[PDB]
Design a protein around this ligand. Sequence first.
Ligand code: EMC
Length: 278
Amino acid sequence: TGLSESMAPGDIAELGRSAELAFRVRFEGALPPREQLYWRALTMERFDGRRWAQAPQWSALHWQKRGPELRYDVIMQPSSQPWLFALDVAQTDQTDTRLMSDFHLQRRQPVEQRLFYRVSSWPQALRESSIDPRTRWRNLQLPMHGNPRARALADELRQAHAQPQALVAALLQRFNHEPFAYTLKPPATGADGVDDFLFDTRSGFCAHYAGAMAFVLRAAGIPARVVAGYQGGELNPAGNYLLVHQFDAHAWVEYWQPEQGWLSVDPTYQVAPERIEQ
Ligand code: EMC
């Protein structure tokens, strides 16, 4: 019926089949291009071998406004969850909502009735040029056992690429140069689900790419997490608004380094750029 605190690919696929409305958005000025419309809901910082899940957050979070400010109104359908949707980094007019330590908005109560809120976002904000130690630590967590081939790949990438930007670029280039497939009905994978996807099936959808990428970054010593939300939306020119449906559900990645802070990346773009762009 909506996003939840945990993500396995099957949950995202189920949202992919639903035509239910998640929210509608009206921008104060021009509509941003589709590829900037990443509606962040929550982050998933725990990986247990099988799925990515939300960890506990707290509220000072170090960030700095810079670049353009986007202003828009949202009317949200009931989700039964306490997170609000918004472009990163968001501030809202809701006095019962706070920007949490993973840059997601948490409301005091779950959204059980339609809700209107106003938002200002800074998509180019500097996020944690210095990081909270709990956050850095948490975002390097992996199970000690399982997915050994992906861990081996991470070790290789770490040796060849001392700088995180270069390592991330090489991992993205693997998705782009190897013949990975983007499909909503991929082959099943086993207990080493990261290894199976990366090396054997090489076929999946946004959740596979996001999860595997965050896994390999962590195993290479770069803090990383999965971001869950929606991307894109359908324009209704008669009302000057966008509709965002459950089928717009999407997962991506962000990774941390000193000074530059958190940077977002969508590995789906390496295999299905048309889905993101159009
Ligand atoms: C619902 C396909 Hg990322």
